[PDB]
Write a protein that binds this ligand. Structure first.
Ligand SMILES: Cc1cc(C#N)cc(C)c1Oc1nc(Nc2ccc(C#N)cc2)nc(N)c1Br
Lengths: 401, 550
């Protein structure tokens, strides 16, 4: 028996154009969809269904997997999956020694989708050179990728997990989209043993990598320590503190720029003052800690900014109001797009663990370039929202490591 | 016939109700034509006559077909249409010839009375009710509703195309070696069979079509086939013949049309240019208005006419070979490219001319062109080409690393086809010892638009100039230009304009701003330039001493 699903009032379903796909991905999607069809998961639809949602194929492991981009649908169903029922995020998760991520997307394939909602899940497999009409389907069952699916399966999921949760009260299990997040403070061997145990419960209802949220620490704005200092060195120093001043209460610059008096050659060396010596010492003491005055507001979107730092290094900040950093970090270790892609999934994962929310990303790249390529490296079953921006070149400098 | 295929379920938009428009009284001879037409339609099942009950109605009119004395039946579905649900887009996107494969035999079948051959959702038919008015409106009219897809109704193209697709399925599946493209009421069929086995296959197709309600006129050309602006032959293709007029005088209208034809020819004729012609179209002039061709436009026109004189063709796609794409810098901001699998038999060619921003360099543009060509390739062939680019590997990787945006291009090779794309200057990475430090600053007054731009150096030089109707951002550019023209071959420059710094550290080699181009020519002449930023009004030494003087 299905659950009635309503869109947000005044909104019609998604009408998003299908991205062009390479031969191999189209082939993989035909294969997969031919099978899902024979099994009743999806059915062919006619032209009286106007809606559309993009699909892609990704490579998990060498095996093609279908990925449906439900970002619009999720946005237009938001009232339903967020505030009717809806899934509480546990504050305890981010505190565990180990969190394991388990894909449980298969669970939705066994639950019928409300007959009147199915048409909104329409997608199209395109053909090369537009030589034939796209192949068109909609869903008969809870689709992977739709925020409605975990909302609806919620009740079943806690029945499946009750025994295991009751037997291990110190383990935190949180569901987000297609994934289960499982956190304990057990030793890593005992932790893995418990994941196996959990897998076995899962397996009775039809479900056949590791994070360490502690080892997540801030990436402070760092103030160089230096042998000697040039005027240029001081000016960079003053600008980085000047900008930190926008974020951190208590930052002081006065007796530091006292050094930069008159008009001096950039390369001239200037000795360090008693005064100044204490400042950057105390500013460093300040930059080490979390921002005083900044708190997460659950009614607001999270934003993530990323900067390309060079040599395979990337810096990022997560805030809700610009400059009010909830968290800062870096990613490292050469295809630019591949690395950015990895960084986005990493940042999205931490954000899920910490707030139970995905950020909207400001990506330092060309719209057209990102869209061509991100598919090649994407490995998650969710997709965050993103826009494209030109990194203010100074912001890059002030977050360098 | 009327196809035995299932109907497509149709509804009206959720708030709305069916049309209820009143019929305009008609001329006596239009009424007569309408009765004739409708009587014939009704005998073929296309329409059925109704009586109220049925509360709906939509106006019918009738026009005399050209001079040739036939009447056509017009229905005006405006109101039914505004009230009908949206449908999926028929098929957005049409094939490019460069993407087609070669065929030995091709034939074009057209479907007779296509829309009237497809049944309409039984439940929806009432909303198509119309009325032939009596003479001078004096007695009740004759009322009909459609049983088939009406011409002019919103749902017809989409439902017809979906019907044809369902009907073609089994035949496509049983005949994987033959290919069929659908468009509107035409079918385009091609095979690698010899005329005999092929004509036999055509007949099985027609037979299969007719089994499903769709007639296709019998067995009465050869290549070339004119198709969608193109000329198709069995193993090659070109655009349909382009004729550029000779005129002493060109209207805005004539030039628009010429640019359109040239743009169309650029799909297969290498190196067509329209930059100079397009500049003529700049401004706000009337269509009938005559525009003197500038000298460059007049030469560009010539250059193109020289390219167009003898025909060129493209070849078709062989799925077993790589695609090679080559790009050349043409004019300024102009890029041209060719795609082939065997040198130099182009499957097609193209132009790229877009400007992303006010300031760019050749490396950035080349990358954008590569991006546009990659997407075109996904669409046409389902894979990306191997590129051949007039840029050195060392140049590319020097740009990519030092630039703050992420980028990436697929497999490519250097090819020495000048002009080569180069970075024309590099900014120093560290302050230059022994180079004069210019502390610059510009600032404008908001309501006066009057500005000052100037500098102080560590060597004691100073200078301020006045600027008229300027902005704050221009004066900051002016200050930097000032420092460049008054300094030696090596110079450190300290600004407080993130704006100015953003532009210049991006390393532009071309701009829409004249000022910025001046700064650029100046940057190329230097031997070393180091650009630094400081926070303004933060009392920084050199800053608040050239800020105080400006
Ligand atoms: C059969 C056909 C005819 C015309 C038309 N008109 C236009 C189109 C889009 C066609 O479809 C296809 N044609 C070809 N090659 C082809 C080769 C030679 C000629 C010739 N002469 C025409 C088409 N390859 C396909 N995959 C498809 Br699908």
């Amino acid at each position: 028996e299905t659950v009635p699903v309503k869109l947000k009032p005044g909104m019609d379903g998604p009408k998003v154009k299908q991205w062009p796909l390479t031969e191999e991905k189209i082939k993989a999607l035909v294969e997969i969809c031919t099978e899902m069809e024979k099994e009743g998961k999806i059915s062919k639809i006619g032209p009286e269904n106007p809606y559309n949602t993009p699909v892609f194929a990704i490579k998990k492991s060498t095996k093609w997997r279908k990925l449906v981009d439900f970002r619009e649908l999720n946005k237009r169903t938001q009232d339903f999956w967020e505030v009717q029922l809806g899934i509480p995020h546990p504050a305890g998760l981010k505190k565990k020694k180990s969190v394991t991520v388990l894909d449980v997307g298969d669970a939705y394939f066994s639950v019928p989708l409300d007959e009147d909602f199915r048409k909104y899940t329409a997608f199209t497999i395109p053909s090369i050179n537009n030589e034939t009409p796209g192949i068109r389907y909609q869903y008969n069952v809870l689709p992977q990728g739709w925020k409605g699916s975990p909302a609806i399966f919620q009740s079943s999921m806690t029945k499946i997990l009750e025994p295991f949760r009751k037997q291990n009260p110190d383990i935190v299990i949180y569901q987000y989209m297609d994934d289960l997040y499982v956190g304990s403070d057990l030793e890593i061997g005992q932790h893995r043993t418990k994941i196996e145990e959990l897998r076995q419960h899962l397996l009775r209802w039809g479900l056949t990598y590791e994070l360490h949220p502690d080892k997540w620490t801030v990436q402070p704005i760092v103030l160089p320590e230096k042998d000697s200092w040039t005027v240029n060195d001081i000016q960079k120093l003053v600008g980085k503190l000047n900008w930190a001043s926008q974020i951190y209460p208590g930052i002081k610059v006065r007796q530091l720029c006292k050094l930069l008096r008159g008009t001096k050659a950039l390369t001239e060396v200037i000795p360090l003052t008693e005064e100044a010596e204490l400042e950057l010492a105390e500013n460093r003491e300040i930059l080490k800690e979390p921002v005083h005055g900044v708190y997460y507001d659950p009614s607001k979107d999270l934003i993530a900014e990323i900067q390309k730092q060079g040599q395979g290094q990337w810096t990022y900040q997560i805030y809700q109001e610009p400059f009010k950093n909830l968290k800062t970090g870096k990613y490292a270790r050469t295809n630019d797009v591949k690395q950015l892609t990895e960084a986005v999934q990493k940042i999205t994962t931490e954000s899920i663990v910490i707030w139970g929310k995905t950020p909207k990303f400001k990506l330092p790249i060309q719209k057209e370039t990102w869209e061509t390529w991100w598919t090649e490296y994407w490995q998650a079953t969710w997709i965050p929202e993103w826009e494209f921006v030109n990194t203010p070149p100074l912001v890059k400098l002030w977050y360098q490591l | 016939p009327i196809s035995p295929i299932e109907t497509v379920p149709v509804k009206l938009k959720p708030g709305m109700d069916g049309p209820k428009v009143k019929q305009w009284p008609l001329t006596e001879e239009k009424i007569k034509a309408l009765v004739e037409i409708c009587t014939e339609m009704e005998k073929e099942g296309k329409i059925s006559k109704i009586g109220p009950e049925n509360p709906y109605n939509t106006p019918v009119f009738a026009i005399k077909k050209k001079d040739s004395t036939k009447w056509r039946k017009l229905v005006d579905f405006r109101e039914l249409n505004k009230r009908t649900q949206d449908f999926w887009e028929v098929q957005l996107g049409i094939p490019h010839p460069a993407g087609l494969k070669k065929k030995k035999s091709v034939t074009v079948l057209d479907v007779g009375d296509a829309y009237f051959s497809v049944p309409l959702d039984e439940d929806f038919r009432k909303y198509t009710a119309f009325t032939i008015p009596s003479i001078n409106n004096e007695t009740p009219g004759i009322r009909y509703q459609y049983n088939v897809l009406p011409q002019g109704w919103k749902g017809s193209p989409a439902i017809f195309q979906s019907s044809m697709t369902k009907i073609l399925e089994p035949f496509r599946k049983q005949n994987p070696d033959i290919v069929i493209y659908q468009y509107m009421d035409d079918l385009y069929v091609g095979s690698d069979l010899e005329i005999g086995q092929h004509r036999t296959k055509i007949e099985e197709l027609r037979q299969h079509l007719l089994r499903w309600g769709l007639t296709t006129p019998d067995k009465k050309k050869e290549p070339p086939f004119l198709w969608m602006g193109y000329e198709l032959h069995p193993d090659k293709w070109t655009v349909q013949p382009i004729v550029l007029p000779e005129k002493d005088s060109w209207t805005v209208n004539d030039i628009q049309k010429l640019v359109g034809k040239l743009n169309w020819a650029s799909q297969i004729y290498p190196g067509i240019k329209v930059r100079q012609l397009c500049k003529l179209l700049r401004g706000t002039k009337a269509l009938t208005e005559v525009i003197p061709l500038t000298e460059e436009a007049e030469l560009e026109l010539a250059e193109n006419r020289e390219i167009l004189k003898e025909p060129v063709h493209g070849v078709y796609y062989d799925p077993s070979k790589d695609l090679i794409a080559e790009i050349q810098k043409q004019g300024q901001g102009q890029w041209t490219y060719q795609i082939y699998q065997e040198p130099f038999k182009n499957l097609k060619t193209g132009k790229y001319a877009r400007m992303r921003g006010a300031h760019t360099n050749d490396v950035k543009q080349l990358t954008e062109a590569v991006q546009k060509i990659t997407t075109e390739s996904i669409v046409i062939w389902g894979k990306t080409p191997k590129f051949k680019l007039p840029i050195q590997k060392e140049t590319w990787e020097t740009w990519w690393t030092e630039y703050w945006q992420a980028t990436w291009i697929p497999e490519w090779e250097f090819v020495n086809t000048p002009p080569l794309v180069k970075l024309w200057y590099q900014l120093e990475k560290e302050p230059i010892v022994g180079a004069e430090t210019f502390y610059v600053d510009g600032a404008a007054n908001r309501e006066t638009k009057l500005g000052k731009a100037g500098y102080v150096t560590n060597r004691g030089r100073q200078k301020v100039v006045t600027l008229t109707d300027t902005t704050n951002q221009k004066t900051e550019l002016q200050a930097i230009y000032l420092a460049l023209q008054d300094s030696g071959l090596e110079v450190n420059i300290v600004t407080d304009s993130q704006y100015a710094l953003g532009i210049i550290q991006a390393q532009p080699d071309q701009s829409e701003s004249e000022l910025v181009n001046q700064i650029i020519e100046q940057l190329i002449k230097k031997e070393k330039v180091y650009l630094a930023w400081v926070p303004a009004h933060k009392g920084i030494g050199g800053n608040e001493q050239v800020d105080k003087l400006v």
